[PDB]
């Protein structure tokens, strides 16, 4: 999983921000969202989302679909650590199981069901 956000912001600063934002908003989780490599989907200008821990993956799909103006017939897949997360999972559960060492959760989105194809 390569994220441009991690190229743009050194780890030491990401970790400091993640620690502070979890203390400030403990009922939310910090999520970095980016297009998967070679996905044919519109860009997402906003990459930083503070998501209620109880929000479902399905609710988050609905939000991102709207933000990138998908047509009804367009597909959308999420990837976390190279795997599609269950639609019924909460974002807090995904965070607990997959956050990186900077305390952020990284989600890639794509029109393909295989990451980076």
């Amino acid at each position: 999983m390569k994220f441009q956000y991690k190229e743009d912001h050194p780890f030491e600063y990401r970790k400091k921000e993640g620690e502070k934002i979890r203390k400030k908003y403990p009922d939310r989780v910090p999520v970095i969202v980016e297009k998967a490599p070679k996905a044919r989907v519109p860009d997402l200008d906003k990459r930083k989302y503070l998501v209620p821990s109880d929000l479902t993956v399905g609710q988050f799909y609905f939000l991102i679909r709207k933000r990138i103006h998908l047509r009804p017939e367009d597909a959308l897949f999420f990837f976390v650590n190279n795997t599609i997360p269950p639609t019924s999972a909460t974002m807090g559960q995904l965070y607990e199981d997959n956050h990186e060492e900077d305390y952020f959760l990284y989600v890639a989105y794509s029109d393909e069901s295989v990451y980076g194809k």
């Binding site: 930083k48 989302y49 503070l50 998501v51 479902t56 799909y61």
Partner: peptide, 13 residues
């Protein structure tokens, strides 16, 4: 940049 504050209990279809 700033965090987007996502609202609770939104739609899903």
């Amino acid at each position: 940049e700033e965090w987007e504050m996502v609202p609770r209990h939104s739609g899903s279809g």
